[PDB]
Amino acid sequence: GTGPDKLKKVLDKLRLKRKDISEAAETVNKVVERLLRRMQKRESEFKGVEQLNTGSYYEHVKISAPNEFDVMFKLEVPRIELQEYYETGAFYLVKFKNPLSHFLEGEVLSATKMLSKFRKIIKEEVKEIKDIDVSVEKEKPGSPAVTLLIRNPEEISVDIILALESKGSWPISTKEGLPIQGWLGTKVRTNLRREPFYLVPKNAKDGNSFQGETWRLSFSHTEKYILNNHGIEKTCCESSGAKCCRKECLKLMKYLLEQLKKEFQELDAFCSYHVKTAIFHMWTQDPQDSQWDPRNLSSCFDKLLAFFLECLRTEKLDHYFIPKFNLFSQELIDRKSKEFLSKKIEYERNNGFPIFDK
Ligand SMILES: Nc1ncnc2c1ncn2[C@@H]1O[C@H](COP(=O)(O)OP(=O)(O)OP(=O)(O)O)[C@@H](O)[C@H]1O
Ligand SMILES: [Zn+2]
């Protein structure tokens, strides 16, 4: 009945959704493993592909849509030379200091050519999977994912994202990113930044020339590590430690946005990565595990909402790893969309969150 009890009931509702998601993920993993084995046996530019087990499912914060999954296939590419396309770090061109020589447009790696060959090979090899009902969805223009359609008998879509892996040092645009020093610490930050980084094809949608061939940085591996190692204490949420409500707040906020986006197409510009980025900042601002005690679920959720509303008001939400990349810039999301979302969030906040019941 009370506000705090109603919020705990929403988490119970999300917990019940996880059984169907876990069962679908088992079917997805069977297909994905089968396909990866085929691509690893075939001789091609992609023989080295491996699954990167990242994203919301592997972070344990996939809260809905058991019929939709994303998987990332990483491919190590030695001797990558990056060129900033946007000097904020939002987009890069890939050049080389070559196994990928067939995909070059001049000196620039063509995502279009590379993805075309990736898709062609996936389609050939998926046709050889005989004991699962799986096909490749017809290509959609503007969608770089290669989408598998699995029938189990119900349809599950799996977006396969090709990611390049670079073992070089992280780009200079990330120099002041990952501001975890007061929370996870400087040794953790040093260790995380020695890991590879990833490049994911994404069209910049602007004054062209090399529109089509741009890539965005991806730190999905780092983000998974943070989600699963999120406490100032090493034992946070372990069997010999204390539970916190950090992930619960993320799930509630993701669900709030999902429910709002379902009702209002004015909110198309917003996505769950905005919520994830916001909570990364909130975990940096409030680093103590005691600031995320389970008994403070309601007040922690409310401070996350307040922080998100302030990001909307100031049209500023910096990418956690790329500080000059403003996800809420006027250029990327118009002012009226932010004011619309601010109005909806404030309504939910002051009226007991009726949209959770939808
Ligand atoms: N709009 C986006 N902008 C930047 N990165 C994004 C965006 N959407 C997804 N990502 C990338 O994907 C990861 C976060 O997405 P996630 O794994 O939660 O998938 P999802 O399909 O959005 O999840 P969910 O179904 O839980 O909402 C990060 O590695 C992030 O870099
Ligand atoms: Zn915890």
Numbering used by the authors: 144 to 240, 246 to 506
The authors write:
Cyclic GMP-AMP (cGAMP) synthase (cGAS) is essential for the host defense against cytosolic double-stranded (ds)DNA arising from various maladies (e.g., pathogen invasion, ionizing irradiation, and genotoxic chemicals). Upon directly binding to and dimerizing on dsDNA, cGAS cyclizes ATP and GTP into 2′−5′/3′−5′-linked cGAMP, a unique metazoan second messenger for initiating type-I interferon (IFN-I)-mediated inflammatory responses. cGAS is central to antitumor immunity, host defense against an array of pathogens, and regulating autoimmunity. Here, we resolve these numerous fundamental mechanistic questions in innate immunology and present a unifying catalytic mechanism of cGAS. Finally, we reveal how mouse cGAS achieves more stringent substrate selectivity and higher catalytic efficiency than the human enzyme. Together, we set forth a unifying catalytic mechanism of cGAS in which dsDNA-binding pre-organizes the active site into a rigid yet adaptable lock for two sets of keys (substrates and intermediate) necessary to specifically synthesize 2′−5/3′−5′-cGAMP.
We next solved the crystal structure of ATP-bound mcGAScat without dsDNA via soaking. Here, one ATP was clearly bound at its designated binding pocket (Site-1), but the second NTP binding site (Site-2) remained empty (i.e., the GTP binding site). Strikingly, electron densities were missing for both the ribose of ATP and Mg2+; the catalytic residues stayed in the inactive state and the triphosphate appeared suboptimal for coordinating Mg2+. G dsDNA-free WT-mcGAScat bound to ATP. The ribose was modeled without density for presentation. Considering that the ribose of bound ATP was unresolved without dsDNA, we hypothesized that these interactions underpin productive substrate binding, which would also allow cGAS to discriminate against deoxy(d)-ATP.
